Design a protein around this ligand. Structure first.
Ligand SMILES: [Ca+2]
Ligand SMILES: [Mn+2]
Length: 237
């Protein structure tokens, strides 16, 4: 029952729900079964960066993920987000673990949305940038097991005292202000997001992944969305 558009960094291959047989980046439109994927050579324990871009003229949601000293991965999907999402949304980060586990640490997150109207003074914009996260980060809405401030970072899923990731965990952080992504006088609407993340696991098979997502403003974690559902979807439809 929420509406979800997401870019997933999916670390575990669930081949019965359509994943390819390797870690991958994907574009999810109202379903965990990605509309488009690309292979991702995820590196356990290294800091990675993902970038997400869209605009209402081209109507193409694109993402790129990379690590220093490595080649990038990229995915794009043609989708008119004015037909999928409401006029006002919230934007956020989500991650989960299941039987298999990893840390889902966010070290920085930035976002910019712009609406240009046909007026003389055309520009409307929202921008935020976090390069550290406090214990009490009042402009984020934390859901589930998400916490901020441990080492100045945002830990989307549970990590024990000694730094070990926990299984069967799910958490999200959403920016506190609603974001206006369509307006009747806008001639161009666009957005960009970037986040840096550290996925580490003591295991040879980490799971489940991190996603950037855009949702209805009152979105909440679906019941039972640990593991393969990434904190985003109530089922694998
Ligand atoms: Ca998966
Ligand atoms: Mn997937």
């Amino acid at each position: 029952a929420d509406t979800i558009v997401a870019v997933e960094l999916d670390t575990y291959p669930n081949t019965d729900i359509g994943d390819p047989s390797y870690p991958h980046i994907g574009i999810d439109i109202k379903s965990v079964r990605s509309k488009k994927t690309a292979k991702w050579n995820m590196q356990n324990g290294k800091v990675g960066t993902a970038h997400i871009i869209y605009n209402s003229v081209d109507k193409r949601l694109s993402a790129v993920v990379s690590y220093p000293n490595a080649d990038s991965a990229t995915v794009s999907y043609d989708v008119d987000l004015d037909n999928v999402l409401p006029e006002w949304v919230r934007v956020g980060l989500s991650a989960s673990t299941g039987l298999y586990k990893e840390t889902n640490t966010i070290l920085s997150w930035s976002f910019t949305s712009k609406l240009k109207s046909n007026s003389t003074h055309e520009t409307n914009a929202l921008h935020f940038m976090f390069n550290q996260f406090s214990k009490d980060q009042k402009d984020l809405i934390l859901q589930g097991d998400a916490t901020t401030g441990t080492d100045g970072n945002l830990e989307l899923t549970r990590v024990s005292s000694n730094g070990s990731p926990q299984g069967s965990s799910v958490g999200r952080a959403l920016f506190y202000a609603p974001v206006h992504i369509w307006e009747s006088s806008a001639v161009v609407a666009s957005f960009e997001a970037t986040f840096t993340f550290l996925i580490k696991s003591p295991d040879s098979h980490p799971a489940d992944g991190i996603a950037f997502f855009i949702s209805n403003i009152d979105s909440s974690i679906p019941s039972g969305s640990t593991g393969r559902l990434l904190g985003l979807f109530p089922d694998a439809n």
